[PDB]
């Protein structure tokens, strides 16, 4: 739904994520789990990590963040043509992990906050708008697949 110009801002900012994917992943998950503690309960792997120092010390959580941001980066680089990338993600998050669509909204907010905190200069108003639109499109298409799956 984005313009080419907006996609360029999305991908330009994502290149900075890729310069420290693991660090971005940790910051995003710490923000998600501290702001929305109920999400922490859906991560059986991590629900025992109840302090910020405890999540930061978890190499398992650090590895998961890379997995997550690697999949998200692959989706964003498709500039909306991400049917095949979203299919297995919707399938697992709807029917295996049982993640409400609202939690993807919480994670999207956390991504935006971390990008702004690490890259306040490059993640200005226009890049923030483009990245919000890209994540909104991701959530819309995931929600449509949830419905196809019966969830
Ligand atoms: C922000 C967008 C998100 C992306 C891109 C993403 C991506 C992924 C990927 C690639 C996996 C591993 C493969 C798979 O099982 O499908 C995974 C696993 C998982 N995700 Fe997500 N995810 C997101 C949001 C969330 C949210 C919000 C929750 C719940 C709070 C969640 C909970 C889980 C759980 C429980 C697993 C299984 C992990 C395990 O125990 O090994 N995800 N995700
Ligand atoms: Na579970």
């Amino acid at each position: 739904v984005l313009s080419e110009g907006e996609w360029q801002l999305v991908l330009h900012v994502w290149a900075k994520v890729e310069a420290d994917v693991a660090g971005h992943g940790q910051d995003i998950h710490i923000r998600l789990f501290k702001s929305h503690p109920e999400t922490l309960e859906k991560h059986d792997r991590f629900k025992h990590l109840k302090t910020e120092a405890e999540m930061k010390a978890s190499e398992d959580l650090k590895k998961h963040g890379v997995t997550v941001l690697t999949a998200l980066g692959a989706i964003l680089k498709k500039k909306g043509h991400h049917e095949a990338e979203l299919k297995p993600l919707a399938q697992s998050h709807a029917t295996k992990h049982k993640i409400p669509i609202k939690y993807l909204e919480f994670e999207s907010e956390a991504i935006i906050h971390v990008l702004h905190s690490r890259h306040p200069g490059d993640f200005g108003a226009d890049a923030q708008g483009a990245m919000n639109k890209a994540l909104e499109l991701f959530r819309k298409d995931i929600a449509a697949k949830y419905k196809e799956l019966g969830y």
Side-chain angles (χ1 to χ4, degrees), residues 1-62 64-82 84-151:
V1 304
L2 289 63
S3 67
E4 184 59 22
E6 290 173 309
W7 282 117
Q8 295 296 315
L9 297 191
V10 171
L11 280 63
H12 171 79
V13 164
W14 207 255
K16 313 189 66 67
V17 176
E18 303 186 340
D20 181 10
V21 65
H24 287 75
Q26 296 175 292
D27 287 351
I28 286 164
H29 278 138
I30 290 163
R31 162 96 163 176
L32 174 74
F33 294 153
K34 294 308 295 187
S35 295
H36 312 278
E38 69 273 31
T39 63
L40 186 55
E41 187 89 30
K42 283 281 185 179
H43 272 285
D44 292 80
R45 255 166 88 188
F46 308 119
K47 59 187 204 223
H48 65 286
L49 306 167
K50 283 166 200 294
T51 72
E52 172 162 341
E54 281 189 333
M55 308 145 186
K56 188 82 159 94
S58 172
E59 289 212 317
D60 194 40
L61 181 54
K62 193 179 185 170
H64 187 57
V66 174
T67 297
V68 167
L69 291 178
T70 295
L72 184 55
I75 288 157
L76 289 172
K77 292 174 181 178
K78 301 312 288 280
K79 307 180 194 171
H81 295 88
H82 50 219
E85 287 83 5
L86 263 58
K87 177 171 167 172
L89 193 63
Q91 277 199 182
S92 67
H93 282 67
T95 71
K96 296 183 181 184
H97 314 319
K98 301 269 205 265
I99 304 310
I101 281 310
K102 187 65 145 195
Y103 285 15
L104 307 177
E105 299 167 21
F106 299 159
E107 186 137 358
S108 292
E109 188 293 319
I111 292 166
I112 297 295
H113 171 84
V114 171
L115 291 170
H116 185 58
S117 312
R118 284 170 168 259
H119 318 293
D122 279 291
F123 199 59
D126 286 334
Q128 294 179 48
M131 177 72 72
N132 266 320
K133 282 191 188 166
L135 293 180
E136 184 178 54
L137 174 62
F138 161 76
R139 294 194 304 280
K140 186 185 78 102
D141 286 351
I142 278 284
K145 300 189 139 158
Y146 271 43
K147 302 206 28 143
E148 283 179 41
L149 292 172
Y151 293 70

